[model samples]
Target: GTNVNDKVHFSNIDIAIDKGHVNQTTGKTEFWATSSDVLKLKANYTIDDSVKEGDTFTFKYGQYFRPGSVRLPSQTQNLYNAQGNIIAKGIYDSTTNTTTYTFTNYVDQYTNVRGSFEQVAFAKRKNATTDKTAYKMEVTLGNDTYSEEIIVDYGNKKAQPLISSTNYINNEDLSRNMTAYVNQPKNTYTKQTFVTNLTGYKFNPNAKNFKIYEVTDQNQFVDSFTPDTSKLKDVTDQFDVIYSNDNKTATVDLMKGQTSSNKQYIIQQVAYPDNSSTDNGKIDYTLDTDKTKYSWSNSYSNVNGSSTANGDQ
Candidate 1:
């Protein structure tokens, strides 16, 4: 029996993500996490020799680190191997906070061989946290074990776009509006994107008012959102709105130029019920963005009535 442990090479990366500030009481530094924050445990491994079916890799997250579960549409805490597939579907156990993957589909069945692979997993990290905060994540493979330190910078996080869907833009009560309050606290942004899970409601073809303008930062509720037109410059030629054939999804194509200091730009679109269908359903949206400068935020989604105050229909 050849020793498969020595034939394997492994490396690990753990991340302490968030921004820091001074605490008044402790006189120590504190981390004020962004809209989304986490601790990432990344592992990369290579197998020079064959690994067997029972040969497994198990990862354990520290209890002090408190992990997060999949928060549908908002975020996910899943382990996806670099082999381009989920190695163990049942590995991640939130109860014990561990991930175990047993080798199954290798390049070779008799002599299971999986070459180089990498995977990234995330956990929760918030409040005056620390890079020096005693933290440890364990990874075990074959007969070897690893407890490594997280080495990285406290990469400042950009906030996710605040998306709100409500009906009746005015007391006139004419159309349903989908609004996004995008605040760029970091770098100059080029574009913003919006996708609707309208489910069944049709996007009003004539409601092409995909306008983005500088507005006050709104934490929630669209009732306080309105274009301070004095600060608004119609960059319609520079930024254009392109929608799907069915108007289910819309893309704000940023043709040229960028906005600085993270414009509290508000973009709005309108949608109505389809005459062809009689069913009235909820209109929820997910955010997908692209950036050319610094790292952008993750996908954002919000839905339902009263969550952001949908009209009392």
Candidate 2:
């Protein structure tokens, strides 16, 4: 047999013991592994046609066979030493160009033993796309493709859109934001100058709100805070800007300076629905009454409830 040069590479492999969950039957932690725990390796011949002659590879004390004339498909292989002692176990992933080898705690010598390989389905990759209805799932590996479509019924719970490479699909209805918005002029002369504006910007009375501002020439500058209230409002606790945790509506105080007539200062309160932190300020406002539409366009979606506050500024 001739010697064959082979190279290997591994990706996305992790091995660990089940220390968190205990086995119910044995009443102890179970020792087991999964596809994630096993190693996935990609192997290729160092030289083209190097397998033209029966090739041999030595693993410690045992020898393995490599059909020198043909490329091997994905499969599982077992390694044993000269004494027929199992040395290692592995799976070859042709679809992903990988071969996994896990070591067995055993050894032997002075006996006729050889490694063997068996063709088996390990993992695979296939290109796929989904419409507004069909759903797809993804794994992180190179062969991260799934063809089976399973539309899970979420029952009473609404289905949130699952982020994917191509598009975001949702079967939910249009739910308008619910929060309240108010505008108040800053009083510099009197301590009670910060009075809430009646007929203020309307917002969903039950959604979260943030104070967004637009200042020009320091027109409506609040007292002492003559030049600007931009920095004062954001970092300091000066403004009555309060956030909420319970579904209760919050408020923001807008303070105007003495130059209320000469200069220009504007502050608008914006409202966001629940899960704002996870959505990170993104909201879908497409007005589709039905059909489980999949929007391919970008939306600023008045999720912030900016329309009623400043009127599309």
Candidate 3:
């Protein structure tokens, strides 16, 4: 606290999903995570002899990143100095959606020290079905900032997600990425809509968060749902997404039929419950019959939300 001085020499951060579960893909082969998923992050910092007793280090949490536990036990132990006095703490601000941490003189005078530590937290990806989000939790002191890329998987599992066509390589953009800069708005977290007929079809409120296709071959309800990239345009303007007062039944219409062959647009009633997760802010799923007569289910965290995943990207 004497003056602005750079003592922490090297710093970096990385992430894992629930103890690096293989079922949880962070990249390549496939990319996905439920809104209910957790992010485990590790941060490493090294300080030189210049960092003496009473020096402080501070950093802030990325947007939408909330405390997973009130505080993890390990983190609590780390918060205390060698003398068992509290030397580190995280102060959260709801309006800004951030948690700033300060570590007070964690090491003694003229000493070199390092700690590669881990922290678990919530990444509020449930917002409007955003695509490819990453955590940017980093620390800054003196003249340097510590950061690394840890992509979050935001894909959903629903109805086996049969896309009529997909270029998973191009689709990989939806996986997650970060470079150059780590915070504020990045292309990573854009809201995106994908293809899959639902138990009850409806338009997601996010402008870019919903898309469906109609094949021109009268195959309604039979392989009728396809994720053809060419057909990935939002047809929301063309169809009327009528709903019940209870908000359970949402329907798309083809009453004014355009005379064209194979014009299979989504028609008839689609039903789903938007019952939500209060603390978790998650979309709940229940078993129901798809038009295929097979039981199916998926997620939509908010009433106007949607999620999807393709394979082997």
Candidate 4:
């Protein structure tokens, strides 16, 4: 057992990961969380009494595809049956999670490309007599569960990247926020998740656009959401919610100076007009346009409308 406080000899850290914790988000000073069994990596280095200096160490990480899965072209929309004849194999998209398949072109979106990574971790250090090599980590993502095993080969003596408490939430806030939103309960504060990158990859600060997926079953109390005027919370409902990629940025290629990004729009609520038959009991609210009058609208029946005739302004 390597006491976190104890000084242990660490060599070239090919990678390193971290656990979860709470932190501020969206300037709301909220608690957020993250996945476990986190991973961290590093460059080459040597350890004392373990190996001599200038020794080379290699680290390889690969993502394998489901066997028998073929790379098909976007136009290739034919399914094959038992007779080995073309049947009905439609296109699927996993752009969000980067699954084994994508409906894009054949040549592209085929292999599981390296999404993101870091450089090396700490510098190599002198080797010790004890066997304190393995570190334990846990991950909780949907039904998927597992831990990560990071192997650090300290060759010649080198310095290890000092593991910081803030490393988990350093810049991976978006993922933490998303994970929190998904796992969190309605109207409750969920802790933030942390992502530690031992690779020392500069935080990619490129914003990307995220599409707003309409929630099928809106909140049943949407109609009850009257404008408090005194304290109006951002458009929020028990059920339906929007998504956005606004203010999200990342380094497309940290190796090169080139980069690009997509502008984001607020995943706000789009209120539907009132239904006279419902005794004006219908819900409605302002959307991207947060004018004064046009506020708190419908989240039910997918009805969108404005309060004032001209606008909420």
- List the candidates' TM-scores in order: 0.34, 0.18, 0.38, 0.17
Which residue pairs of candidate 1 clash?
31-128, 184-262
**Stretches of model 2 off by over 4 angstroms after superposition:** 1-209, 212-214, 218-236, 243-247, 256-270, 275-313
TM-score of 2: 0.18
Which model scores highest in TM-score?
Answer: 3
Estimate, for each residue in 156-187, the C-alpha lDDT of model 3 and write its tens digit. Answer: 22223221211110111121110000001111
What RMSD, rounded to one decimal, does every model reach? 16.8, 22.2, 13.1, 24.4
**What does the lDDT read for residue 221 in candidate 3?**
25
Residue 180 CA error for candidate 3 (Å)? 36
lDDT of 4: 0.20
Off by over 4 Å in 1: 1-159, 167-174, 184-192, 214-223, 227-231, 254-261, 276-279, 290-313
The weakest ten consecutive residues by lDDT in model 4 span 64-73
Go through the candidates in order and give each one's C-alpha lDDT.
Answer: 0.41, 0.25, 0.34, 0.20
Model 1: per-residue Cα lDDT over 1-313, one tens digit each: 2334555555554443332344576665433222222333344665554655445555555543333311201122233345565433225665655555555454233243334333323323322133334345445543456554432212222354443423222212323454544553433445544454455455655755666555454332223232344455554545656668588656653323455234555566665545533324455554444542211212212222111122211
Best by lDDT: 1
Q: Residue 77 of candidate 2: its Cα lDDT?
A: 58
* Model 4 ranges off by over 4 Å: 1-13, 17-39, 45-177, 180-313
lDDT of 1: 0.41
